[PDB]
Amino acid sequence: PVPESQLERWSHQGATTTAKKTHESIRAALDRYKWPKGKPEVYLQGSYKNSTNIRGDSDVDVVVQLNSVFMNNLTAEQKRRFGFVKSDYTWNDFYSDVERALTDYYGASKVRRGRKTLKVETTYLPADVVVCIQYRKYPPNRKSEDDYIEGMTFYVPSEDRWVVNYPKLHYENGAAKNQQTNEWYKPTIRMFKNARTYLIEQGAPQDLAPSYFLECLLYNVPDSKFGGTFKDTFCSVINWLKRADLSKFRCQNGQDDLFGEFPEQWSEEKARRFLRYMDDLWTGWGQGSHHHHHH
């Protein structure tokens, strides 16, 4: 088994002061720009937002979201029943405005386009900026105009496709689970992240448990498994996952499937591998070895 003090150290959160200032810096840059069709909101997602960061020096995941217009899954008839019209301001237009705002504030040498994000070197931490528009997922047929689930969406020019994410729901649901586990859920995520990274440092696979997939995996574990001590939590969580039917696990945002064939999803086999590595870490700790010819 792993000593409690080791698990407790692994549960520590990295500092967040510099990440928060990075967020405030991006926000201040956008405040200086004149927005032609709505001023976007700026919020954090990712590990810092969700209090699951195990370091204080990782890049900051920032969302720059336009809310004056929305993309959606409505049919033309549903749009008509709601009185909706087309926005003449596009995601492409908005992206160009955000890029100009950031370049004006930080300078061209500090702002560059990535595949899916704008990367910004601030005076605090580097920011990975997702430029997106509000996305409304509406139910079928004729329903109320307030009956929708809110996410966001962005275009990937290199892949001719739209991505829809739900970071606000990811945050909301993780916070709710943390409240209901007497604040053990987020320390437990960090414990497993640090356990994973400890193994990767020793040669375990780089993709043993990508952070987002690991959070989603743990989100599916009953609240009763989190608490008491870190040793009891480590074993109760891993033993429940080993016996669980993973196939219907949902992401923490409540919208997506965790497992599937797309690269946006994990695989059950990768999750089972993570469980095997946690088992081995636990059972191997404190054990003596020798070569088989000395047994």
Swiss-Prot record:
Free-text remark on how the cofactor is bound: Binds 1 Mg(2+) ion per subunit.
Residue spans crossing the bilayer: none
Record keyword Nucleotide-binding present: yes
Top-level EC class as recorded in UniProt: transferase
EC identifiers of the protein: 2.7.7.-
The keyword ATP-binding is assigned to this record: yes
Positions with a binding annotation for ATP: Q45, G46, S47, K193, S211, E264
Residues bound to Mg(2+): D59, D61, D128
Catalytic activity: UTP + ATP = 3',3'-cUAMP + 2 diphosphate
Pfam families, A to Z: NTP_transf_2
Residues that bind UTP: Q45, D61, R115, K116, T117, L118, K119, N165
Cofactor(s) the protein requires to work: Mg(2+)
InterPro entries: NT_2-5OAS_ClassI-CCAase, NT_sf, Polymerase_NTP_transf_dom
Region entry Disordered, spans: 1-22
GO molecular function: ATP binding; metal ion binding; nucleotidyltransferase activity
Family assignment from sequence similarity: Belongs to the CD-NTase family. E01 subfamily.
UniProt name for this protein: Cyclic UMP-AMP synthase
Native organism: Rhodothermus marinus (strain SG0.5JP17-172)
Lineage summary: Bacteria, Pseudomonadati, Rhodothermota, Rhodothermia, Rhodothermales
